Every structure is written in C-alpha cells, then in structure tokens.
Design a protein around this ligand. Structure first.
Ligand SMILES: CC(=O)/N=c1/[nH]c2ccc(C#N)cc2s1
Length: 342
C-alpha cells in the first residue's frame, strides 16, 4: 500500500511536491527531469542563494550503487586544478534525505536536442557549431587526463547543456553510464545513433569512442538531423558504411560481431549482407554538408563564415573524428590544433 512511509511510489521514486522545504535549506520548485536513476528537481538553495539542480536517485540498491560511482567520478574531477574541468557539470555536494541519495548540481539551461527542436531540425550555423566543437574537444582533453582517463560513453545532443540561454557556453551532463579506462566489462554501450564501429563490432575500445560520437553530434548540430539514424544495429552499421564505405579487412578480421553485418567471401574480402541503401561510400559527407552548395539544404548560402574553404575545414575535421581505426582517430589535443579553430 505505502512505500517509505508514503514518501515513495511504485518505481521507488521520491514523490516530489511544489514548495517543499528540505533540511531548512533547499526549497523545491518543480520536476525538471526523469530517467531510470530517478528524478531531477529544480530547487532554490537558500544558503548559497542560488538555483540548483538536485538529482534524486531512487531508493533502490541498484540505482544507489550506480550513483555512488558517479559521485566518485565527479569528485575525482573536482580534485584537479585545470580550467578544462568547467566544461563538465559541477557536483556541488551530495547528501542522504529520506533514504534517497541526492546529488546537487549547478542549474544549467537548455540541452542541444531542444536547440535542434527550436530550429525545427534545420540545425545551427557553422559559427555556433565551431564554438560547441571547440568546447567539447576541450572537455574530452580533460577526461583524457592520464589520472582520470574517463569515457563518458553516452555522448549525445541531449547530454550537452548550455550554461546560459544567452551564451554559447556548454557543459556535459549525465555521467551515470561512465567509467574510467580499464579491461573490458561492458559491450552494450552508447546511444545507437552515436555508437562507434568498434562497439558495434564488439572489439576492444577506449576513450576514442567519445570522439566518434562527437563527430556524429557536430554534423547533427549543423544539418539538424542525425547523421546515422539506425533503427537497429544492422541498420546503424549499414548507414555508416553508406558514408565511410566498408571497414578495412584487417579490422573485420578481428571483430567478434563481423558476421552480424558482413560476410567473408571466398576471395578473402568482406562485403555487406543483404536485408534500401546506397552502395558503400557514396553518401559523401561532402554532399551531406553541402560544401560547395551553400550548406545543408542551401540555407547557409551567403552567410558569413560559411565559405567553401570554411566547409572544407569542417569536413576534414569530422572525417578525422570518424576514422574507423580508433588508433588513428583524432585525439582531442590534435583536434584543438586543427585549422577549423583558427
Ligand atoms: C532542465 C533544465 O532546464 N536544466 C537542467 N540543468 C541540469 C543540470 C544538471 C542535471 C543533471 N544531472 C540536469 C539538469 S537539467
């Protein structure tokens, strides 16, 4: 009948209520998020005199244990002095309240998915995309700090938020699915649209999977539509092949899941299995971006900073972010050194 003395519901969530006062400090405003982990509420901190985002975890061992990993990752990031850490959302403090673990975060603004939505999925300029690009590449340089070596593992537009409605400052949220580099435990990771080929193929993976996702995201922000919108993994991989062609043979010769998407012919070469799709490597990024044709759908023709040279610098960077070889894929340091950010 009742759960946690009438404070919880069926799904172990805390029943949030407008204007509730927690610990004579936090004044609860309204619900602003929901997921497996639980809920995210907007609250006014009366001590610090500032709005905060309180992530209320479910009263369940499984979720609690996951939140404790996240706290440990966020606190470990807060230990470092570097100025790159401010592209990661800031854990202010955490506490237990009515058997729920509550993480207090700074109050950020709209996520980049709502930004796509606000454009009716037509995208944002190459100028704004440069600014997001440069900030994200710095955030990934930060996670790549040797002592951190953190893979965020679920990079997507909705997991990137603006600090302010009126600014192009962004921060990465949701480190729930994140872990530090190590021996492979998990194989079903990343949101499918932004899932890297090594994961799809089930090969060993490292921090390079976040860069693949970054490149998918940067093309989405500018064109307005996902670059690879697979309905399932077979569809996801075919859609990648459309743009980048067949993965090299030495890669497919290693992959546990090669034969889920491909077939090794008697000559030794690898080809797609049938299920539709353009032949391998004929949906050129050159044309998806509209390099020489005034951008995506010709909507950027005549707009400052959207010249043919500018598009060729954007294109080149993205192709280095979508390298099939994670060994050869562009690292965050060399990315910040790219002609596109001049
Ligand atoms: C939804 C909104 O307007 N602002 C938000 N800001 C934040 C900040 C951190 C988290 C987490 N975890 C969630 C949100 S939602």
């Amino acid at each position: 009948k009742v759960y946690n003395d009438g404070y919880d519901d069926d799904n172990y969530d805390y029943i949030v209520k407008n204007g509730e006062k927690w610990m004579d400090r936090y004044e609860i405003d309204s619900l602003i998020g929901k997921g497996s982990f639980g809920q995210v509420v907007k609250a006014y901190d009366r001590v610090e005199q500032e709005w905060v985002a309180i992530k209320i975890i479910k009263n369940k061992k499984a979720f609690l244990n996951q939140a404790q990993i996240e706290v440990r990752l966020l606190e470990l990031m807060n230990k470092h002095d570097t100025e790159m850490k401010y592209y990661i959302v800031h854990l202010k403090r955490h506490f237990m309240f009515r058997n729920h673990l509550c993480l207090v975060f700074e109050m950020l603004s709209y996520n980049l998915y709502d930004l796509l939505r606000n454009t009716n999925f037509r995208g944002v300029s190459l100028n704004l995309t440069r600014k997001f690009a440069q900030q994200m590449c710095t955030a990934l340089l930060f996670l790549a700090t040797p002592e951190l070596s953190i893979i965020h593992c679920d990079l997507k537009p909705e997991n990137i938020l603006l600090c302010n409605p009126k600014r192009s400052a962004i921060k990465i949220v949701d480190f729930g699915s994140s872990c530090q580099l190590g021996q492979r435990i998990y194989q079903y990771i990343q949101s499918r649209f932004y899932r890297s080929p090594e994961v799809l193929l089930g090969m060993p993976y490292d921090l390079a999977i976040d860069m693949w996702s970054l490149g998918c995201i940067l093309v989405e922000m500018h064109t307005g539509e996902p670059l690879f919108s697979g309905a399932n993994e077979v569809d996801q991989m075919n859609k990648i092949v459309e743009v980048l062609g067949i993965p090299p043979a030495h890669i497919l010769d290693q992959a546990p899941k090669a034969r889920k998407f491909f077939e090794k012919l008697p000559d030794g070469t690898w080809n797609l299995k049938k299920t539709e799709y353009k032949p391998p490597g004929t949906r050129k990024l050159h044309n998806i971006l509209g390099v020489e044709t005034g951008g995506p759908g010709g909507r950027r023709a005549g707009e400052s900073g959207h010249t043919v040279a500018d598009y060729l610098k954007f294109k080149d960077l993205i192709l280095r972010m979508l390298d099939y070889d994670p060994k050869t894929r562009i690292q965050p340091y060399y990315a910040l050194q790219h002609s596109f950010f001049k």
